[PDB]
């Protein structure tokens, strides 16, 4: 047995956080393929979301690795289908992405508060090291994108959506 | 004599498909030079169509080579002049290109159905190997372009046509 | 408008000359594939004619480019099928090729005489620069080949046709 | 057990096709050594057939590998001695080689028809991928050679046989 | 004395053509600096015209060199100030540039007609070699630019002028 200072409550919340990262990965998978449709065709938006799918997957994998390192047991649940089949405009999609990110970020903060109350400094360090700053950086970037997308709608939405995709993404 | 399992019906349809690829080549030749006119001047649209002329020619040449490999006899017909002397906007041109591509693709599918009914698996493989996936890929790309061109017309068609040509093509 | 010192008569004759180069290209296409037949199988003769197809195409493309540069309008006609479906011996084929070349060359000379009468020195230079010397060089080469092919028929035509293809082409 | 969608009929026909490729290999072995005899001495003809021996062997080996991959059982029979001890002229030999190739090719086509009736698309793909086009290419090449050999017999058969071997093979 | 077959009429017209190239150079000098004004600030338009100033100067220098080579005497006149102190929009400027180019081109054609009537084939070659095709190419390019500038005015002239300068020039 290696397990030491690792509460059952932290273990369960780690498994839930894995499910949340894998669900986010799947959402981004769906977002990316929507933007590859012939009737949507925004290559840069596609690559943005498919890159996010991969980051969220890797996030999950790091959590699973840590779960094993601490002597927890990984437990997998169903992955819920993404919340939409079609994602609207780049604007709608980027709003939905930031809502999702803020939910992951809140889950990280809740897990951290749990870690602190359980006096589990390895867990707190792990989150700080690999998750909290990355999520803050990602959210700031999405925020910046959203501001630029919004700036570009004005009178000519098609034009703005095209330019954004060509010159930013 | 090398000829084996090669029906006269397949042979004739191969010669027709050659004529269709060469005609497509000629259409793209005309499309490219229209976009090089001083009063049209869309360099990127020109290069897109002149690249297509060359692919369609090479398509024809591969069919002719296969015709000879199987012991068929190449038979050439007149090449019909393209359907238009002037091709309108990039939008009109890209619509016309996708109509042409869907007609080639239908001809490939009809030749394949013939091959299958004649039990000619070399022909079916040949089409699969070098034509069916290429045409599907090309059509998807045209579809994507058309979506972006359309997105860009909105209120300011000149502006959109220029941007598309500079930033996509 | 860019057009200057460019007569409608020159413009039409340029379009006709394009048709003649594309027709020549198509003839050479047919000549090349005839020599790739399993029952003809003269690899070097094939490569000679397929190289000519490509030169004639490029000739056409240079004419079209010049048509646009001068502010003329390219107009495409049907391309007539080559004059033969089967081309006989290398000798017959090379005779037919030199007849075709002399017809292109006469058309270049007629266009030049037109240019001179219209006082269009850009056109005269263009023809001199890229067409007249090339055609003269090509015809001399064909002439040389024909002399060597003829020398080789004598009593043993098969033998001579094989040697020519292996040691010259 | 790995075996899935793999009929006993396909399995048996695969073993027969292996025997046919190994027999062809052996025939080419005999053809090559006949042309290395001091009283035949046609080095290029020898290398042509010994290269074919090796291709036919490799063909057999790919079939055996696939047999194992699908969970079939390889079963070996006697290899029949080649049909001739002495192979005559390069012409006779090349005719005999094309007869042999057309028999392999018919066996491939029969196995493919079997695959299609058994709804075994892995087998159909395997044949298409590695056998059908290769055999078609090889037969076309033999056909070309035969045409050139025949062209060369005329009045002076020794001369023609020597030239062919030096300048083509 | 080297002078041979070089008429006094050609000599004078060569000196006039030098004055016309130097005047064009000076016009382009003025055009370039207008577009470098802080209240105009179109860097790409500036570089386009300053590059033209240099080409026109070099044109003059080649004419002077040829004048000396033939044993003519260079005679210099006043260079007339450009026709405008301020050049308006990129559109106005490009129209004015094409008017100027068509005037040079007409002068080249008139000098050529003179050369032909004086039976001075060195002069005709010189013009053909270094001036007639270059001017035709330059005019076609200006024509293309003008078409794209015009396409871009539509409703939002400032926007179009900026994009043209950033993405074409
Ligand atoms: Au994607
Ligand atoms: Au993508
Ligand atoms: Au802590
Ligand atoms: Au901490
Ligand atoms: Au903490
Ligand atoms: Au083009
Ligand atoms: Au082009
Ligand atoms: Au099939
Ligand atoms: Au198939
Ligand atoms: Au099929
Ligand atoms: Au060829
Ligand atoms: Au060839
Ligand atoms: Au002339
Ligand atoms: Au001339
Ligand atoms: Au002339
Ligand atoms: Au051998
Ligand atoms: Au050998
Ligand atoms: Au099939
Ligand atoms: Au199949
Ligand atoms: Au298949
Ligand atoms: Au099949
Ligand atoms: Au400047
Ligand atoms: Au500048
Ligand atoms: Au002259
Ligand atoms: Au001349
Ligand atoms: Au002249």
Curated annotation (Swiss-Prot), chains A, B, C, D, E:
This is Ferritin light chain. It comes from Equus caballus (Horse). Residues 4-153 form the Ferritin-like diiron domain. It is found in: Cytoplasmic vesicle, Autophagosome; Cytoplasm; Autolysosome. Stores iron in a soluble, non-toxic, readily available form. Important for iron homeostasis. Iron is taken up in the ferrous form and deposited as ferric hydroxides after oxidation. Also plays a role in delivery of iron to cells. Mediates iron uptake in capsule cells of the developing kidney. Delivery to lysosomes by the cargo receptor NCOA4 for autophagic degradation and release or iron. One of its GO terms (biological process) is iron ion transport. It comes from the Eukaryota. PROSITE patterns: FERRITIN_1, FERRITIN_2, FERRITIN_LIKE. Belongs to the ferritin family. The keyword Iron applies.
């Amino acid at each position: 047995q290696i397990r030491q200072n690792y509460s059952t409550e932290v273990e369960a919340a780690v498994n839930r956080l894995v499910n949340l990262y894998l669900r986010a990965s799947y959402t981004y998978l769906s977002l990316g393929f929507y933007f590859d449709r012939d009737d949507v065709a925004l290559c840069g938006v596609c690559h943005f979301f498919c890159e996010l799918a991969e980051e969220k997957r890797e996030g999950a994998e790091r959590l699973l690795k840590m779960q094993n390192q601490r002597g927890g047991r990984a437990l997998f649940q169903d992955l819920q289908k993404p919340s939409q089949d079609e994602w609207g405009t780049t604007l709608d999609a980027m709003k939905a992405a930031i809502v999702l990110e803020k939910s992951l970020n809140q889950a990280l903060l809740d897990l951290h508060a749990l870690g602190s109350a359980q006096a589990d400094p390895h867990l707190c360090d792990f989150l700080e090291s690999h998750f909290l700053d990355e999520e803050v950086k990602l959210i700031k970037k999405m925020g910046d994108h959203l501001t630029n997308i919004q700036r570009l709608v004005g009178s000519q939405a098609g034009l703005g959506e095209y330019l954004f995709e060509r010159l930013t993404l």
